[model samples]
Every structure is written in structure tokens, then in C-alpha cells.
Target chain A: DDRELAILATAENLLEDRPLADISVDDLAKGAGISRPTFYFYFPSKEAVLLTLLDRVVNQADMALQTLAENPADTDRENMWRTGINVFFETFGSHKAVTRAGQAARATSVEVAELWSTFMQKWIAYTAAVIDAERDRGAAPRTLPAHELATALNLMNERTLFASFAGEQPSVPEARVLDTLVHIWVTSIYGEN
Target chain B: DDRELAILATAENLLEDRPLADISVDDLAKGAGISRPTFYFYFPSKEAVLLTLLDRVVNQADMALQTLAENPADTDRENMWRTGINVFFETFGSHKAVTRAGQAARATSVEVAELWSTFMQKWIAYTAAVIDAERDRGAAPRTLPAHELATALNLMNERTLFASFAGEQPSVPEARVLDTLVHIWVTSIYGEN
Candidate 1:
């Protein structure tokens, strides 16, 4: 974990005060009191550190989602949704360059967006799975399609999620945005539309 | 006109190869068979050239909407609503870089976002005015707020327009995105929960 220690320590320093364009791995290595060679042992590129951070946050989110089992009957999925968004915000908020870097990455790097989207799809799948279970228990519509429901929930989530990155507080981040999106998610997918 | 020609040509060349970040004012000026000073003389900066293109496109959209006289029927209001979106999309399809630059500028710069928001608010005001007309005509409900309807329509356009740039294409070429948004717009405005 020493190599991991090097990357994280320097990345936070570079990202906190400097622009993403100005960051270099050598800068991080020097800050970490490690050789540049040691830095390469743990990460492939500067972006790898971001990916690593993303994974760490996502795991934290998974742990939070696991807690939803405590209140299976609570209709407000916003708590679970907030948990995932909060993970990225808490991490990126402390390092603003990471937000700009992530924006640029999503625009240009299909691999990056797909990595995020895959996590997004997984989150959606788990959510649909919950609703599917509810359907079986006669709480939701029996005819609910898991994948489509997943698509709708995640699509709504994404509209807010990435847009939230555009603004520090995201005008769309209010409970109203989530409520409107969730309302659409349930009604358009199940209610008499 | 020479300045305009230089910008369009340079921007066309820029888009052909890579992101706008790769190109420079010197590169654009060189292509225009002029010195960098001459380019700067015509435009304050490369960003000004980009914003000029956006202004031209927004002007076209404004002109199209201005042609439609205000009517006091809900159907007429809806028709104008549809027309506003169509004009916005058709303008963007013809001048994509304008759309590209507009989005980037708005996302990154507060001043430009305010300018862009003003353009949208003006459009919304027109739509809201139409909604007010319809209420006066006894064809639309008085309980529904005009500004709220207008704001809803504007948000739909903003969401789909951003989705288009993000390559998330709610449908293809923005036509379907507009259609989906209009469906959501009309449904949400008229239906009370």
C-alpha cells in the first residue's frame, strides 16, 4: 500500500491547488517522498489514480446500499441514490481538478464514460431488482420489466448525477429534481400513462 | 465577413481532426493567410469568434419564433412550443460548432451562461405569454401558472440539448429528443398530481 500511498498523497496536493493540466506524476512522486519508479509500480497513468479513487468511493457506496436491507419497505429510494452520488461528491469536492478531469474524460474517453456507465447500470440493475422483489410481494406492478425499469431509474439518475458535476450544488440536485425524476420513473414505467 | 470566413474555415478544420483544445489562434490565423495580430484585430480572442457564431445561430432561432404571432388557444400555444424546439434544433444542426462552443462556454463561464440563460428566458417568456393568452381566451386553465409551464418547457429543451452534446442522444439527430421532451412537457404542464 506504500505505492498507493504515494499516488493518493501527491494527487490530492496537485488537484487541490493546481489545474489538472499542470499535474505530473513526478510532481506526485516528489511530494510522496518516493521515487518516480515507485509511483509506476502501482499505477499505469495519471488517470489510473482517478480510477482508483472512483473504485474506492464506489465500494463505499456498495456498503451503503447494503444497508437498505434494513428498511425494505421504505418507498423513498432517494437515500440509496443519495449514497452513491454523495460518494463521488465527497471525494471530488475536496479536489476540484478531479471534477474537471472527469468531465473532460467523459467527453473524450469512451472507456471512462463506459466505466462510469457500467457502474451506473449495475446500480440500476440492483434498483430494478429491488422493485422486482416488491412486485413479487404485490407492492409494485407485477408486469414491471426489470431492465427497462433499471434504464429509466438510471437515466433519471444520470441526468442529475453528471449535471450535478456541472454545478457545485447542481440546481437539479434539490429533492424536487429527484422527486420529479422518481415520479416519472414510477409513473411512466408503471402508472397509467 | 473576412473575419467570419476565417473563423468558420478554421473551426471546420479544427473539428475535422481533434478537440478545440488542440487548435490555437496562430493556427487559425495562419490558415486564414493572416498574421496573429490581424486575427486579434478582427476578434478580441478565439473565444469571441466562437461566440459570434453562437450569436448568429441564436439570432436565427429568435427570428423564427418572432414570426409566430401570439395566439389565445392551447393548441396554438402547443404548436408554438413545438416550433420553438424545432427552430432551436434545426439551427444547431446547421451550426453544430456554435452549439458546441455555446455549451462549452456556458458550462465553463458564468458570464456566458448568464447570456445563454437570458436567451432561454426570453424564449420562455414568449411561451409563457402565449400560455397567458390562452388562459384569457378561456381555452386553457387559469389555475396553471404560465411561467411554470414555460420553465418546464425550457428545462426539457436544455436537458435534451445537453444530452445531444454528451452523445447520450435521447433519440437521433435531436428530432426524437425534442419529441420526447414535448410529450413530457405537455403531459406535465396539463396534468395535475
Candidate 2:
């Protein structure tokens, strides 16, 4: 388990500064202070290691969402939404390298794509449940179906974070990016109340 | 010019049926009724062909946006927004294969990425201009800075459509996808009044 952790740690460190494609299995093994065969003993491939690392990051993200759901700073919907957006920014922003790697891998690897797709479905379900709860409480007006709204909003977060991390243009300043996303989420869900 | 058009058409047809990676230069050339050397004469590589095709598609999309801006279906702000969103869904949806290919190419090809980025910036500018005009006319309240809002919303459209076309998980039904996007755009920009 320690060696496996080491491999993951090395991957995270390397990916912070280099692309996953540039980092080789040999490099991963060497960084972990293990031989190639020993590396094989723990993981089948570099992609497999990336999948594991991404899984951990995504799970941590889910836990953050759960924490917010269970305990809110205040009952005001906008504040909760703002805080929730911050949770995602901080969670994914902290692990930009791993998140970015997963984004790249999803395009090329069926395995990675499936893992990401499954994770997205879980997040969408959670978000939809929250939306439905709001509608049930008569706090948020019923408009678009909760599930569809959740899917769109979740995908917005996914793509916005990805573009920010990738530094894709037309660039929005970091603070403004958060503000805009929070504003969009708040306005879309709660309206300009 | 005709031969170049033929190559582009062949690429579009081929891409609709199979991925860019699977379709070879020979296939493109033959489909266009040209030799491999002639294909080279028209485009440097298959990616170049794809870029041209994507450029055409994006330009067509831009034209659709312009049409919506020049002529709204009605004076109602929400109606305009709904029409604008429909413009996007139809423009991008009709050319799903070329759009998907462009999405894929953006990840790996700098040229394609640049072209796509430029197109996004153009759209954002146009969208921001519309938002600013609405605020100036006292039609819509000012919220987030228009440009930032435009960027976020445009990115949302980009990602949402890509996911739908890619058939990504937690799939929102086609009709609902449009409805949700329109809802978000209207509420975010105009509130739920």
C-alpha cells in the first residue's frame, strides 16, 4: 500500500509540471524507488495508476459535496450555493494536475471515460436530489426538470473548471471566474432574488 | 477550389461514419476522387482538412448567432433568449460529427484549438455585447460582468452540447436538454420574473 501510495504521489508531483504522456512508467517506477517489475506488481499500467489517483480525487470531491449538504453555513440558498461552488473550486483547484490528466485520458481511454462518466452520473444524481428538495420546500420555483437542470449545471462546472485549469481562452480572471460561476449557479437556481 | 471542397466533403462524410483516427488520408483522397499527392496539394494533412471543415462549421454557427441578434422572434426577452438557444442547438446539432471532430482535435492540435478558441472569443464578445445592450436598455438587470457571464454561458453550451453529442452519461433527453439550457440562460441573464 505504501509503494502504491508512493507511485500515486510521484504521479501527482510529476503531473503538476508535466503532461501524463510525458511521464513514463519507468519514471513512475523510478520515482517510487521501485523496479519496473515491482511497478508491474502493484499496477498494470500508468493509466491504471492515473485512474486510481483520479478516483481518489473525485471521491474526495464527493465527500466535500456531502459535507456541504449535511451541514450548511446558513439556510439562505444563495450563500449555500456560493459556498458549494467554492468547495468545488478549492477541491478541484487543489488537484488541478490530476483533474487535468483525467480530462485528457477520458478522450483516449475507454476505461478512464467510463470511470469519469460513472462519477458524473453520481454527481448529477446528488445535484438533482438537492434541486428536487428545494422545489419540494417551495423555496425554488419549479421550472426545468430537476434532473436535467442538475445535469447541465454539473457539466458547466466540469467544463468551466477544465478550461480554467487548461488556461483556455478567452480567459476569465480567476476571482472573476469563481464569481461568475457562483453568480450563474445562484441566479439559475434561485433567480435574481 | 472544387477539389478542395471535395476533400472537405469527403472528410465530413467519413468523420460522420467513423472517427478521424480511423479514416486515413488515402480514404479521404479516394473519397474525394483524388490521388494522395493531390490530397497533399489541397491540404497538408488530414488534420488540416478537419480544421478547414471545422472552420466552415464554426463560421456557419457564427452566422446563425448573428441572424438571431439581428432578428428576434418577438420583443419578449425570454422569447429572444429561447430563440437564441435554439439557434445554437440547431446550428451545432446539425453538424454533430464535424463539431465532435473539432472537439476531439482541440485537445491534441494547437491549430484546431486556436481556431476554436478564436471562435469562442468571437461568440463571447457578441454575447457580452448583447447583455450590455439589454442592461443599457433597462431590459435586463446587470449581474455579473457581461463578458464573464458570456464566457461561462458559452462554455456551458459548448460542454453541454458536446456531452449530448458524445452521448455521455446521465443523458438528458434531447428536448429537455434544450429546455434546461434555455432556462439557465434566461434565468441567469433575465431572472425568473
Candidate 3:
């Protein structure tokens, strides 16, 4: 297990300087102080290592969301939205290299793509359920269908965060990023109130 | 100019079957019935050809937006949003392969990345101006700052459209895609009537 973490740690470090495409299994194994064959024993390939790292970050974010959902004080719709959005910024934002590596791999690797899609679907369903409940309680207006609205909002978070972390331009100022996303999510679901 | 058009047409066709990475300059040249040198004469590299095709599609969309902006009948906020959104679906949607190829290239190619970033900034500024105008006239609620909201909304369209075109899972139904997007845009900027 220590070796496994070493491999992941090495891969994450390597990713900071270069892309996942350039980092090979041998490089990962060497960095972990293990033989190439032994590396295969722990992970099939470099991508699997990247995915493992990404999964940990995603899992952490998911757990935070779960905790927030269980908390009674954060039950107000806007507070819930803000806390939920911050979970992503903290998790994905802090683990940007791993997240970006996974995103780049998603286009080429079926395994990575499926993992990303499954994660997105899980979040979309949860958000949609929240929207439906808000509408039922007469707190949020019925605008777009719950599932579709959730899909767009979640996708916005994905893209906006990706651009921010990737340093794509006309960059959104770092200070304003969370508030910008929260505003769009809140206003879209709950109207101007 | 026919030879250039031939190369463009050939690249577009090849991209539909394989990714830009797999489609070599030779393949593009051969498909266009030209020598490799002649291909270089027309475009610097495969990426340039891709950029050219994408620029054409983007230009068409921009022109359509300009026309919409100039039209008096479509001056209402919602109609303007609907028509503007349709311009993207019609332009980028119809040229799926080229658009996807350009998007994929944006990651690795500096030229393509700059082109894409410039295009996004131009559109974001236009949308932000519209939002500011609507706020000035008291037609829309003051929510997120105009530029940040525009960035999020535009990025949402980019990601959602890319996913739709690339056939990502939990697909938004084709019929609902446009309405779903329009609803989010209108609600986020203008709020519930």
C-alpha cells in the first residue's frame, strides 16, 4: 500500500511539470523506487495510477457533499448551494493536476471516460433531486426540468473549473470564481428572489 | 484557391472518421489529390487546416449573431438569446467533426488555443454588453456581474455542446438540448417573469 501511494505521489508530482501523455510507466516505477514489473503488479498502467489519484479526490468531494446534506444548520437552499459548490472548488481546485490529467485522458481512454461520466451522472441526479424538492416546497420556481438544469449547472462547474485550473484565458479572477458560479446556480434555480 | 478548398474538405472528411492526431499530413494531402509540399503551400500544418475550417464555422456563427443584433424585430431579450443560441447549434452542431477536431487540438496546439481563446473573449464581451444593456433598461435583475456570468454561460454552452457532439453518456436528449440551454441563459440573466 505504501508502494501504491508512492506511485501515485510520483505520478502527481510528474504531472505538475508535464502532461500525463508524456509520463510513462517506467518513469513512474523509477520514481516510486520499484522495478517496472513490480509497478505492473500494483497498477496495470500509468493511466490507472492517474485514475486512482483522481478517484481519491472525487471520493473526498463526494463525502463532503454527503456530510453537508446530513447537516441540519446548512439546510437553507442558498447556504446548501454555496457549501456544495465550495466542496468542488476545494477538492478539484486543490488537486488540479490530477483532475486535469484525468480530463485529458477522458478523450482517449474508455476507462477514464466511464469513471468521469459515472461521477457526473451521480452528481447530476443528486442536484436534480434537490431542485425537485425545492420546487415542491415552493422555494424555487419551475424553469428548466430538474435533470436538465442540473446537467447544465454541473457541466458549467466542470468547464469553468477546468478553464480556471488550466489557466485558459480571459481568466475569471480567482477571488470571484466561487461567487460567480454560486450566483448562476442560485439565480437559475430559485429565480431572482 | 481550389487546392486550398480541397485540403479543407479532405481534412473535414478525415476528421469524421478519425481524430486529428491520427490523420496525418500525408493523408490530408493524398485525399486532396496534392503533393505534401503543395499541402504545406496551402497550410502550415494539419492544425492550421483544422483552424481554417473552424474559423469558417465560427465566422458564420458570428455573422449570424451580428445580423441578429442588427435586426429590430428580435430585439427582445429572450428572442435575442434564443436566436443567438441557435446560431451556435446550427453552426458548430452542423460542423461537428471540424469543431471537435478544433477543440481537441486546442489542448496541444498553441495556434489553435489562441484562436479558440480569442473567439471566446469576443463572444463573452458581446454577451456581457447585452446583459449590461438589459440591466440598464431594468429588464433583467442585477445578479452576477455581467462578464463573469457571460463567461460561465458561454463556457456552459461550450462544454454542453462538446459533450452532445462527442456523445458523452447521460446524454441530454437532442430535442431538449436547445430549450434546456435557453432556459438556463434566460433565467440566469433575466430571471422568472
**Model 2 agreement with the true structure over B58-160: per-residue lDDT tens digits:** 8888888887667644777777777777877887788889988888888789999899899889889988988899889987887788898899998998889
Candidate 1 residue runs with Cα over 4 Å from true position: A2-6, A9-19, A22-37, A58-101, A108-110, A120-156, A159-170, A173-176, A184-193, B9-17, B24-37, B66-80, B104-156, B165-175
How would you encode candidate 3's per-residue C-alpha lDDT over B1-193 as one tens digit per residue? 9899999999989999999889899999999999999899989889888889988988898888888778664656677788889899888888999988888777677887888888889999999998998899898878778999899899999989887777777656667789888878887898632
Write candidate 1's Cα lDDT for A1-193 as tens digits. Answer: 8768667867866775764557887887888887888888888877777666655555665665655545554455435444444554455444455555655556556666666666665676776777677567764555434554454345544545444445532234432344444434444334322
Q: What is the lDDT of residue B63 in candidate 3?
A: 89
TM-score result, candidate 3: 0.93
Indicate the worst ten consecutive residues by lDDT in candidate 3 chain B: B71-80
| Every candidate's lDDT | 0.59, 0.84, 0.86
How many angstroms is residue A162 displaced in model 1 relative to the true structure, after the best TM-score fit? Answer: 4.5
* Whole-model alpha-carbon lDDT for candidate 2: 0.84
Q: On residues A1-193, what C-alpha lDDT tens digit does candidate 2 reach at each position?
A: 9999999999999999998889999999999999999999999999899999989988888898888778744677777777877877888889989988888888789998888888789888887888788889888887777788888888888888788877879766666778778777777877632
- iRMS, candidate 1, in Å: value is 5.3
Question: Which regions of candidate 2 fall more than 4 Å away from where they truly are?
Answer: B71-74
Off by over 4 Å in 3: A73-75, B73-75
